[PDB]
Design an enzyme around this catalytic site. Structure first.
Site, short mmCIF file in Angstrom:
data_model
loop_
_atom_site.label_atom_id
_atom_site.label_comp_id
_atom_site.label_asym_id
_atom_site.label_seq_id
_atom_site.Cartn_x
_atom_site.Cartn_y
_atom_site.Cartn_z
N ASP A 180 0.83 -1.21 0.00
CA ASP A 180 0.00 0.00 0.00
C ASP A 180 0.86 1.26 0.00
OD1 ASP A 180 -2.88 -0.93 0.34
OD2 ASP A 180 -1.83 -2.05 1.99
N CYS A 214 -0.02 0.85 -13.64
CA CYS A 214 -0.30 0.77 -12.21
C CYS A 214 -1.53 1.67 -12.14
CB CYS A 214 0.84 1.34 -11.35
SG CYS A 214 1.84 2.64 -12.12
N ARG A 220 5.19 2.73 -10.33
CA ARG A 220 5.54 1.33 -10.30
C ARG A 220 5.85 0.85 -11.72
NH1 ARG A 220 0.43 -0.78 -6.57
NH2 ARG A 220 0.56 1.03 -5.13
N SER A 221 5.11 1.37 -12.69
CA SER A 221 5.31 1.00 -14.07
C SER A 221 6.72 1.40 -14.49
CB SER A 221 4.28 1.69 -14.94
OG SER A 221 2.98 1.19 -14.66
N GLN A 261 8.17 7.72 -9.31
CA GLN A 261 7.56 8.79 -8.52
C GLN A 261 8.19 9.20 -7.18
OE1 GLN A 261 4.27 10.92 -9.10
NE2 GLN A 261 5.90 10.79 -10.67
O1 LIG Z 1 0.52 4.87 -10.24
C1 LIG Z 1 1.70 5.36 -10.16
O2 LIG Z 1 2.29 5.82 -11.17
C2 LIG Z 1 2.45 5.48 -8.82
O3 LIG Z 1 3.54 4.88 -8.82
N1 LIG Z 1 1.92 6.25 -7.67
C3 LIG Z 1 2.70 6.34 -6.46
C4 LIG Z 1 3.22 7.65 -6.10
C5 LIG Z 1 4.02 7.84 -4.92
C6 LIG Z 1 4.33 6.75 -4.08
C7 LIG Z 1 3.85 5.45 -4.39
C8 LIG Z 1 3.03 5.19 -5.56
C9 LIG Z 1 2.58 3.77 -5.79
O4 LIG Z 1 1.88 3.54 -6.73
O5 LIG Z 1 2.93 2.87 -5.01
C10 LIG Z 1 0.67 6.91 -7.74
C11 LIG Z 1 -0.46 6.31 -7.08
C12 LIG Z 1 -1.76 6.91 -7.10
C13 LIG Z 1 -1.95 8.13 -7.80
C14 LIG Z 1 -0.87 8.77 -8.49
C15 LIG Z 1 -1.09 9.99 -9.18
C16 LIG Z 1 -0.02 10.63 -9.86
C17 LIG Z 1 1.30 10.06 -9.85
C18 LIG Z 1 1.55 8.84 -9.16
C19 LIG Z 1 0.47 8.17 -8.47
#
Ligand SMILES: O=C(O)C(=O)N(c1ccccc1C(=O)O)c1cccc2ccccc12
Length: 282
Positions: A180, A214, A220-221, A261
């Site tokens: 999470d 993702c 994550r991608s 990210q």
């Molecule tokens: O979905 C993604 O690209 C992503 O990696 N996000 C994350 C951003 C910061 C820390 C962790 C994550 C994760 O997915 O584990 C994001 C998640 C949800 C919304 C997002 C919106 C913009 C950019 C990244 C996002």
């Protein structure tokens, strides 16, 4: 040499700093098409858009938009389409893309629900007998089988073009244990997942590019694509230690914004590559 660079940064807590340099140096191109009012409901996030130069265009003359980017790694000879988890109204677009681009695999790095909210629409059928029909793009999708395992699930799906009646088999590689918050403690299962994807032949040239996502399709991608490519380069070059992960990340960021990210994901990427290296040879 990264193996070393790693420790040099760890026992210096410079991860956040490094990540920021990369953020600063990263390129920026226009996303004029993504911002058009008419595509407001085609974007999950307001600040995650595909650059116009590298966006994937749908072969429909109505609205060729979809939030998806083609990441072409010339040197490693590998391409990836990084896209956002589809929306309740863009699933038909999503599969249209998979069809049009002749993709063989779809890599999913997140769950439909995380931290209590929807991070992606349920775009694939969950029961053999309940197939989905996307009327806007005239596509039928059927669950053929699935193999649920510890850290991931693989599904065989049948995508049919209702216009032509032509069928195709798409593999769904769904990593189901990404935490999470933060990143995995061990890149171990993530590497197994990656190899599992390679093994299916979905990352191979005789196929269209693999579709990866993702929720935003950049965090994550990004780690997935960055790990794969770096591992491929260490395998292809005369000098393996010549692979600069930051260099590669910056090259990928020319095709899509924000790949990787957080400073945590970057650290994790290093870890996955370093670990994957101590295994591509023995
Ligand atoms: O979905 C993604 O690209 C992503 O990696 N996000 C994350 C951003 C910061 C820390 C962790 C994550 C994760 O997915 O584990 C994001 C998640 C949800 C919304 C997002 C919106 C913009 C950019 C990244 C996002």
């Amino acid at each position: 040499e990264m193996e070393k660079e790693f420790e040099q940064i760890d026992k210096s807590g410079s991860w956040a700093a490094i990540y920021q340099d990369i953020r600063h140096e990263a390129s920026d191109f226009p996303c004029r098409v993504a911002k058009l009012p008419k595509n407001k409901n085609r974007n999950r996030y307001r600040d995650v858009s595909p650059f116009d130069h590298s966006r994937i265009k749908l072969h429909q003359e109505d609205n060729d938009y979809i939030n998806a980017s083609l990441i072409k790694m010339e040197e490693a000879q590998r391409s990836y389409i990084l896209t956002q988890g589809p929306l309740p109204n863009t699933c038909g677009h999503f599969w249209e893309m998979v069809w049009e681009q002749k993709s063989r695999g779809v890599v999913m790095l997140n769950r439909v629900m995380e931290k209590g909210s929807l991070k992606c629409a349920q775009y694939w059928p969950q029961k053999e007998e309940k197939e989905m029909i996307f009327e806007d793009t005239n596509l039928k999708l059927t669950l053929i089988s699935e193999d649920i395992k510890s850290y991931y699930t693989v599904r065989q799906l049948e995508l049919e073009n209702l216009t032509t009646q032509e069928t195709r088999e798409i593999l769904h590689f769904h990593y189901t244990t990404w935490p999470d918050f933060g990143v995995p403690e061990s890149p171990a299962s993530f590497l197994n997942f990656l190899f599992k994807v390679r093994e299916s032949g979905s990352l191979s040239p005789e196929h269209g590019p693999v579709v990866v996502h993702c929720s935003a399709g950049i965090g994550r991608s990004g780690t997935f694509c960055l790990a794969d490519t770096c591992l491929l380069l260490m395998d292809k070059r005369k000098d393996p230690s010549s692979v600069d992960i930051k260099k590669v990340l910056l090259e990928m960021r020319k095709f899509r914004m924000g790949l990787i990210q957080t400073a945590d994901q970057l650290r994790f990427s290093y870890l996955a590559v370093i670990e994957g290296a101590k295994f591509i040879m023995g």
